[PDB]
Amino acid sequence: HMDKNELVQKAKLAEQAERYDDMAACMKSVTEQGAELSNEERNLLSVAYKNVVGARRSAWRVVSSIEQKTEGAAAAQQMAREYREKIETELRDICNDVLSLLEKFLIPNASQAESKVFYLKMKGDYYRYLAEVAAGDDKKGIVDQSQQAYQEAFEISAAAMQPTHPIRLGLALNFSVFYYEILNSPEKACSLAKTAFDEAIAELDTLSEESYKDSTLIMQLLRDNLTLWTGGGGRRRETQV
Amino acid sequence: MDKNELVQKAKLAEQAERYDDMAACMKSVTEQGAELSNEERNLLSVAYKNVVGARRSAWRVVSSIEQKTEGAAAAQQMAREYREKIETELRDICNDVLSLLEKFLIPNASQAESKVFYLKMKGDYYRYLAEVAAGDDKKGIVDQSQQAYQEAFEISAAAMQPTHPIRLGLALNFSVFYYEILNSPEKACSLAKTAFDEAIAELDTLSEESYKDSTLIMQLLRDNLTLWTGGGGRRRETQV
């Protein structure tokens, strides 16, 4: 059995090799050893599972579009439907894997506000991924679970973290996307993103260069979504005194 | 199920970039024992190139990292063991493809261009084995790759046009084999240059579609030749 250092070293090797199943298995093993993850181990775990589920999400959108495009061909549409359902099962199993890890190991032992916000955001993300493909009688509960987790994360970070903190900015980005795509609520999605951006830009100048670089990267994403969602109108071009 | 349904599933898997599914569909088609159509042959080879390719790239990444870590030793052992795990997956993939080629693809090939395709594929997958083999094991593997390429080469020189994409692709890969596996760069260059030159003389007779098919591979030959003969005193190019 590998100790923690060997598992982290192997997860980094697997990352460079783009072997994300291996990477996630290593970081799940690290997690279940029961010690609080460091910032870099948190990033390795989250990057690994995002890529693992990300392959299915992309494949799911492709096959869904083919299923919609072949509506006049029974055999072709049925084959695409069955293949989408197969991908969905994989996707749900990955989400349930992550959600179980968050509930059983990560969230209960998060002793600092930063890490708890990170894991509650992650819980919001993976219920959101479930909500992207939920289409039966469980969608309503899943959508609510996502919003509850995001909101709990928002509550802790609003009180414990500066608005420039990358975790708080990343939470605002994804929670905004949840409102836009899952709830079909563009006005709330935009005001949430705009508020987090405005609150950060007021303090951005006070950061060290390295922290500034980190914050600005996420603030770029908030800006890009706002511009995408509001088009040429709404946003007024900027000039400088 | 039926051959046609499996082919449709393979094409769906291709669009979803799920190459394990794609490869599994086309393996089942091959195992039905009927000669593959050109479309089926390309789906099979595309699928397994992607499946094996993921390990080939991972193996090179891990090898490169392993060769650039000199401060530690237990980390060095962990990097080696991870490479050996990737190696085992790579060999199993190659052995899977080589078994299909021996049992179904090469025996059922009724036309010259098909036999050259599969003999080239056999050369390719022994070459992938040769990329990771060591010692006495490597010699036999390299010989297997060379013998397959050479038989494909002799058939294609006799029976296929020099512009045929399969003949040109054989020249390209056989040339890389000479350069990289046999450490014979001049012979690799002469093989690439001769195939390129032999195809030039008949490009004028081709349809637009065949002209593009042939020249796309001739550009890969030229790319390797430019890479292998270096810039030397070459001045960078600008276009009016």
Residue numbers in the entry:
A (entry chain A): 0 to 240
B (entry chain B): 1 to 240
Manuscript excerpt for this entry:
14-3-3 proteins recognize protein partners phosphorylated at serine or threonine in certain sequence motifs in all eukaryotic organisms. 14-3-3 proteins have a highly conserved dimeric all-helical structure. Each monomer can bind one phosphopeptide via its amphipathic groove. Here we study the structural basis and druggability of 14-3-3 binding to E6 oncoproteins of four tumorigenic HPV types by a combination of crystallography, binding assays, and mutagenesis.
Here, we initially set out to analyze the mechanistic and structural basis for the 14-3-3ζ binding to the 18E6 oncoprotein. The phosphopeptide establishes multiple polar interactions with the basic pocket in the amphipathic groove of 14-3-3, largely reminiscent of previously solved structures of 14-3-3–phosphopeptide complexes. The conformation of 18E6 phosphopeptide bound to 14-3-3ζ within the chimera is practically identical (RMSD = 0.17 Å upon superimposition of Cα atoms of the peptides) to the 14-3-3σ-bound conformation of a synthetic 16E6 phosphopeptide reported very recently at a lower resolution. The observed conservation of most interface contacts within the two complexes suggests that these crystal structures can serve as templates to build accurate homology models of 14-3-3 complexes for other E6 phospho-PBMs or, more generally, other C-terminal motif III peptides phosphorylated on the antepenultimate position. Nonetheless, a few noteworthy differences appear in a subset of the crystallographic conformers of 14-3-3/16E6 and 14-3-3/18E6 complexes. On the one hand, in one of the four conformers observed in the asymmetric unit of the 14-3-3σ/16E6 crystal, the side chains of Arg –7 (Gln in 18E6) and Glu –3 form an additional in-cis salt bridge. On the other hand, Arg –6 of 18E6 (Thr in 16E6) mediates a bipartite interaction with 14-3-3 in most of the observed conformers. It simultaneously interacts with the carbonyl of Asp223 and participates in a water-mediated interaction with Asn224. As concerns contacts within the 14-3-3/E6 complexes, the crystal structures have shown that Arg –6 can mediate more interactions than Thr –6 with the generic 14-3-3 interface. Interestingly, position –6 is an Arg in the two strongest 14-3-3 binders (18E6 and 33E6) versus a Thr in the weakest ones (35E6 and 16E6).
